[PDB]
């Protein structure tokens, strides 16, 4: 009912303007792993999980690509 | 062909001889019910002649199963 | 050949060897029946 | 085992035979049935989630069949 | 006096009996040998007259 | 009619001999039905006293 | 097109029917344990159920084959229910499989009333009482019939679980051509769907009940 | 060994508590959820589920198993309870009855 937008209120929110840097923080942190390529001391159980987020996140982009279209099942035309 | 078109209707008509099967089972199977209900200690005599009915029935249901295929595939 | 026979062919014998005999009688009428069937085919 | 494992010798470290494989297949449905089905007060959602992954692979050998009603045409 | 100091030790034994939910029907069976399913005069299963079942 | 497809009809025929005949059977010989316990409280080989 | 849900099904090039008919058995866990879960509580008390249900009518010789028409009843009973799954492929919609329960356990049970029983069995070919102009013609009668049980027993398992499958598709599929018309009628179509699943969920068990006892009855009537 | 008392404390009859409790840290409670929402609409917008027939074959037999689970959940699970409790309570009686006997022996 309306606790969707009292947890909404804190993880479903556009990012604020003062965050990200911290954002790309972590950004320069994950390509420093890979730059080094010590992404092997990751053992599989995180792997996954980031994993799992990064599907999710590209689900966003998938989600805003159902909305660029004005159309749900697949594209209207 | 006319023939083999013909062949189709003769065969599915024939097979609606086995209508009257499906209801003389079922008067059989119903009176066994009704019957047995009545007299539960003859079970094992009604039962002798609801076979023997069930079988008589059917047997007028097949002759038409037997034309069915008789037309079908014998013609 | 071990655990196999333990536990499927003993349990299984009883049933095997004399109680389904008919049984494998009548499978294979159903294989000679299959196979004549998925020969004119 | 794997979630703590960080090697990829570990795959072949494994038994890839036919009694590897089974004992494999035997060791996760034990601990399935262990942790959802073989409890006292148990629930039906140990069964469910299993036709739910049967659905599933249903769904998955049904879609060369599937793919031919499809709506859009892209 | 033979007699009692074998009915105390059985007593012991089916007083310090295994819970029922951990036991198994073969461990019933060592504890009420009445129990058992004669597998020689019902081979087959279910190893009892189905009117008993 | 897919029913009629005599091809792949021993790709059923097996597998159903293979769970009809074998395996579904060996988990009804893993349900047993025990035999209830009433041992009855009247079993003593006794005899009078010694005359 | 229509017929899709009967072929067999094929993964990745591998026939994936072989795994489907092994699965229902894995719904029946078993426990050497004298108290159990739920779900093994349940299925014990069935299984006892129908046991005494089938099994009752049989003498010492006919219950012998106990464990296969229980295992019967579960296998059938097991798969149609797992049939009616969305996109599933029901394996008893199969002519073919169901031809492979049908005649061999209708074949077992006329050849053991034809090894021992045999003047017994060739009598009962005519019924007690039956007049003398009409002996000829009733031995005729029940040869053919008897022919036809196994080929009975297989087609009103195939066609009643083929039938009521194709109409919850082509119903639904009405539904689905009419979500973009009038809401209500897609509503009673709706309605009418779900009462025919439910049906087809009685069907699924007396189908599996009525393939079971026909076996049983032949039995007894050779046992 | 004795039966555990509880299972694996499901979500909805087809997620585990495991998977929420394993993505609470990075993305919150409505991750878990948020996913789900991403990957039906993505499947059923890519024609990975095609909309057919079969799906409102599939509403309806979801529709009665949610229903007659909903129904008959409670009843068949102490009825259960019930057969196990009443051969639990049967077996111990017969447990009383050989210490009485014997002890009058």
């Known amino acids: 009912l309306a606790t969707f937008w009292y947890y909404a209120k804190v993880e479903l929110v556009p990012p604020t303007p003062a965050e990200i840097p911290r954002a790309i923080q972590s950004l320069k942190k994950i390509v420093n792993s890979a730059q080094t390529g010590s992404f092997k001391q990751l053992t599989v159980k995180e792997a996954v999980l980031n994993g799992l987020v990064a599907t999710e996140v590209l689900m966003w982009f998938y989600v805003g690509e159902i909305i660029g279209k004005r159309g749900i099942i697949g594209y209207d035309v | 062909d006319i023939d083999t078109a013909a062949k ?18 079922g008067t059989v199977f ?12 003859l079970k094992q005599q009604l039962f002798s002649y609801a076979i023997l009915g069930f079988a008589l029935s059917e047997a007028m249901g097949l002759f038409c199963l037997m034309v069915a295929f008789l037309i079908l595939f014998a013609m | 050949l071990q655990s196999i026979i333990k536990n499927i062919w003993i349990p299984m014998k009883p049933y095997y060897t004399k109680v389904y005999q008919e049984i494998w009688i009548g499978m294979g009428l159903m294989g000679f029946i299959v196979y004549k069937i998925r020969a004119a085919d | 085992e794997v979630k703590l494992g960080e090697l990829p010798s570990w795959i072949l470290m494994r038994d890839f035979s036919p009694s590897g494989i089974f004992g494999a297949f035997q060791r996760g449905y034990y601990r399935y049935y262990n942790k959802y089905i073989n409890v006292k007060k148990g629930s039906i959602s140990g069964i469910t989630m299993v036709l739910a992954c049967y659905v599933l692979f249903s769904y998955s050998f049904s879609y060369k069949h599937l793919k031919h009603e499809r709506l859009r045409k892209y | 006096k033979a007699r009692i100091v074998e009915y105390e030790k059985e007593m012991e034994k089916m007083k310090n009996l295994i819970p029922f939910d951990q036991m198994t029907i073969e461990d019933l069976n060592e504890a009420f040998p009445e129990t058992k399913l004669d597998k020689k005069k019902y081979p087959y299963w279910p190893h009892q007259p189905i009117e008993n079942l | 009619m897919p029913q009629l497809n005599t091809t792949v009809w021993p790709t059923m025929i ?21 035999l209830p316990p009433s041992p009855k409280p009247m079993k003593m080989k006794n005899y009078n006293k010694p005359w | 097109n229509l017929f899709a849900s009967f072929i067999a099904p094929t993964i990745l090039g591998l026939p994936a029917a072989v795994l489907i008919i092994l699965f229902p058995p894995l719904l029946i866990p078993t426990s050497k344990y004298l108290i159990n879960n739920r779900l093994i509580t349940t299925q014990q008390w069935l299984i006892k159920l129908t046991s005494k249900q089938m099994m009752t009518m049989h003498n010492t010789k006919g219950r012998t084959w106990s464990l296969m028409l229980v295992s019967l009843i579960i296998f059938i009973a097991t798969t149609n229910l797992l049939g009616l799954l969305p996109h599933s492929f029901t394996p008893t919609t199969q002519l073919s499989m169901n031809l492979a329960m049908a005649i061999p356990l209708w074949a077992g049970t006329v050849i053991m009333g034809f090894r021992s029983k045999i003047k017994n069995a060739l009598a ?34 195939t066609a009643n679980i083929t039938a009521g499958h194709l109409l919850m598709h082509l119903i639904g599929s009405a539904t689905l051509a009419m979500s973009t018309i009038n ?32 076996v049983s009855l032949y039995l007894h009537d050779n046992t | 060994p004795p039966l555990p008392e509880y299972g694996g404390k499901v979500r909805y009859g087809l997620i585990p508590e495991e998977f929420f409790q394993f993505l609470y840290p990075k993305t919150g409670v409505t991750g878990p959820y948020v996913l789900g929402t991403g990957l039906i609409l993505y499947a059923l917008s890519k024609e990975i589920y095609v909309i057919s027939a079969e799906t409102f074959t599939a509403l309806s037999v979801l529709g009665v198993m949610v229903y007659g689970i909903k129904k008959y959940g409670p009843f068949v699970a102490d009825f259960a309870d019930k057969l196990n409790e009443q051969k639990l309570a049967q077996l111990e009686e017969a447990k009383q009855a050989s210490i009485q006997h014997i002890q009058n022996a």
Not at chain 6, 16 to 31: E, S
């Open chain 2, 30 to 41: 119903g009176s066994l019910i009704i019957g047995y209900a009545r007299n539960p200690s």
């Open chain 6, 14 to 34: 097996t597998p159903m001999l293979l769970t009809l005949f074998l395996i579904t059977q060996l988990k009804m010989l893993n349900t047993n039905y025990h």
């Open chain 7, 124 to 157: 009962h070919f005519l019924p007690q009482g039956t007049p003398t102009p009409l002996i000829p013609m009733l031995v005729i009668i029940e040869t053919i019939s008897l022919l036809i049980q196994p080929m009975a027993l297989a087609v009103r398992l």
């Open chain 2, 8 to 25: 189709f209707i003769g065969a599915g008509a024939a097979t609606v001889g086995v209508a009257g099967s499906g209801a003389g089972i």
């Open chain 7, 183 to 214: 809401l209500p009628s897609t509503l009673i179509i709706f309605t009418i769907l779900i009462l025919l699943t439910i049906l087809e969920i009685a069907v699924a068990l007396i189908q599996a009940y009525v393939f079971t006892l026909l």
